[model samples]
Target: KVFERCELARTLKRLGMDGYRGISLANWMCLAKWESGYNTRATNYNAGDRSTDYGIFQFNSRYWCNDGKTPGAVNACHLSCSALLQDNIADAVACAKRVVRDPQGIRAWVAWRNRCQNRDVRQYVQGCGV
Candidate 1:
């Protein structure tokens, strides 16, 4: 429960992370479980290629920097984008916040997934909202 609560807290700290806003914390807990098992350090490996993604939320490194912000890389501009790929929960939380809150509007986490989640770290479940 502590892991669940902590990850949810960190997630909620991000701006515009709706879908979970008016929903239940248990819903958020469910999402945290599915995505990262509430582990701050989670990684994904594709068959054979061994290409990887990182963090509890499993952000792809490329967009980990920009994420469709008009002024890409303007916010929290990192010195090394690769360093971000090294897996930092704090940075992943920050990136998710910006995506959800920015002109990108990730509150549409569901709708956005409809268009773009295939590139995401995890296959989204309909209505989980996280």
Candidate 2:
């Protein structure tokens, strides 16, 4: 669903991810804004690699999803890519947490690396009161 920043922040906080793995709700919101504008339907194609990024977190098919069409896909999340493109983000959040557990940590999301890493995003959640 399309969430106000505070709504997203509060939800993430309630999910035990306020500061999950050293990543804050503000940072998550910032990355989501840049990655998908909080759009659950967002999908991007990388023609160079013939791969796709799916949903709010932009999880890549190469590493995280299986469309039953992505050849050699790791399918790490064991989910169909389309599963992420939904109003309910429970699956996306659960997969994202798994991504964070990888060696790259939060850096697994390029949007986070480029738009949120080491940046002060406290303002993103300033009024969320979470």
Candidate 3:
């Protein structure tokens, strides 16, 4: 899905990710913008080892998907990497919830760690009305 920042924030808010439970919608918006520019079909691959990251969240096949091409993948999300690239983000959000519960918290995304964390992200959702 190609969403404007506010659209993504509204979508995530409607999905119950309004920040009361885990990461805030503003932070999520920041992460999504940095990760894939809110493109559901976005993907990143590491040529050195052929590891792939997918979707709006940029989930790694090494730990989140089991595409055969990604050997030794833990498949923690127990779903195909392509699933994350679809317009419907149900599965991606579900998996992301689990990922945020990890020890690293939202630090799982280097984008978040480097850009969103410890930074004022209020502007990311300024007029989203979430």
Candidate 4:
């Protein structure tokens, strides 16, 4: 599912992404905007490491979830990567919270650091009635 920009912003907020582990909804919005364009089925494979990034936040198979084909990848999220592709983002939202629980916090997502960090991200949630 390709979610509209404001829709995703509202959804993330409704899912409690605002200030979760010190990351704002706009921050998550920025990450999702660049990571998957708010598309649920988005994926990217890394042939060099035999891992695939799945779903909205691009949860990497090599570290976040199990894909049954990542060369002994760890399943820190304790769920199949398929769950990340579901239209109902409940599971994905839970996993995202777990991810930021780490010390790195939102920095765990490199894309967020590069794109969302120290930037004016209000535009992501702007005019969305957030």
Candidate 5:
């Protein structure tokens, strides 16, 4: 499902995204905008590495979730990659929290690094009323 911008922002906030790991709601929205356009079903596969990115936050198959096909995977989120594709987003939010527990924090997503890092992101949530 594709989420309307404020719908996603409010949902993320309700799921406890505010100041999660020192990352703000707008920063999360910015990353989602560039990474998946708020698309819950977004999936990207890396052919050579044989791994995939799943869902809005684009969690990696080889590192975060168990896709069963990803060899040497750590599955740190302890969830199936398919869990990230659901529209409910509860599991996705939980897994993302787990991801940020790493020292790299939200920098686990290079999309955030290049497009959102130290950048103006407040606009993403400014009018969302979250």
Candidate 6:
């Protein structure tokens, strides 16, 4: 069964993008359906060791870790102090919005397009950000 749509809607709305527009909420919903199945506890058994990449976004722990390499890889693309990948949806969304928008920069509905270009899963993660 699908998770509560209203709850999802609330989550997205709170993130301020309304399900990652410019591609369509249905598309994002489809990705989320497949990625995490709307389960916040969803995780990849294949990834190994570091399991911080949880939830709907499936954020990579190595990518979000506070270490020099991972953090430097983005190089201040993530403007916040806290490490977003540490299992927080709000932080994930914010980091997603930021990294996705920087080149494309993060600005909710406004900065979603730069992320949608040439994406193989573009249709699926139009709102997924970074």
lDDT of each: 0.45, 0.85, 0.86, 0.91, 0.92, 0.46
The model with the greatest TM-score is 5
Rank by TM-score, descending? 5, 4, 3, 2, 6, 1
After superposing candidate 4, which stretches have Cα over 4 Å from the reference?
A: none
Write one digit per residue (lDDT tens) for candidate 1, span 20-108.
32433333344455556666556565444334444555554444543332232233434233443443455554555554444545433
56 in model 4: Cα distance from truth in Å?
Answer: 0.5
Model 3, span 1-130: residue lDDT tens? 7888877888888888877346788888888889999999999888987899999999998998777797777888889887898999888888888788788878888889898989998999998788
lDDT of 2 by residue, 22-125 (tens): 88788888888998888889999988777899998899999998876666778998899989998888899999898998888888777787888878878888
- Which pairs clash in the backbone of model 4? none
Poorly placed runs, candidate 3 (over 4 Å): none
lDDT of 4 by residue, 58-110 (tens): 99998888999999899998999999999988888999999989999989888
Number of clashing residue pairs in every model? 0, 0, 0, 0, 0, 5
- In candidate 4, where is summed lDDT lowest over 10 consecutive residues? 20-29
Off by over 4 Å in 5: none
In candidate 6, stretches whose alpha carbon ends up further than 4 angstroms from where it belongs are 1-3, 19-23, 45-52, 66-88, 102-130
Q: Tens digits of per-residue lDDT for model 6 on 10-126?
A: 566566764453434444444455556666556553344433444565445454433342322333334332343334467656655544443433222221334432345434434
Tell me the lDDT of model 5 at 8: 95
**Cand. 4 TM to true fold:** 0.96
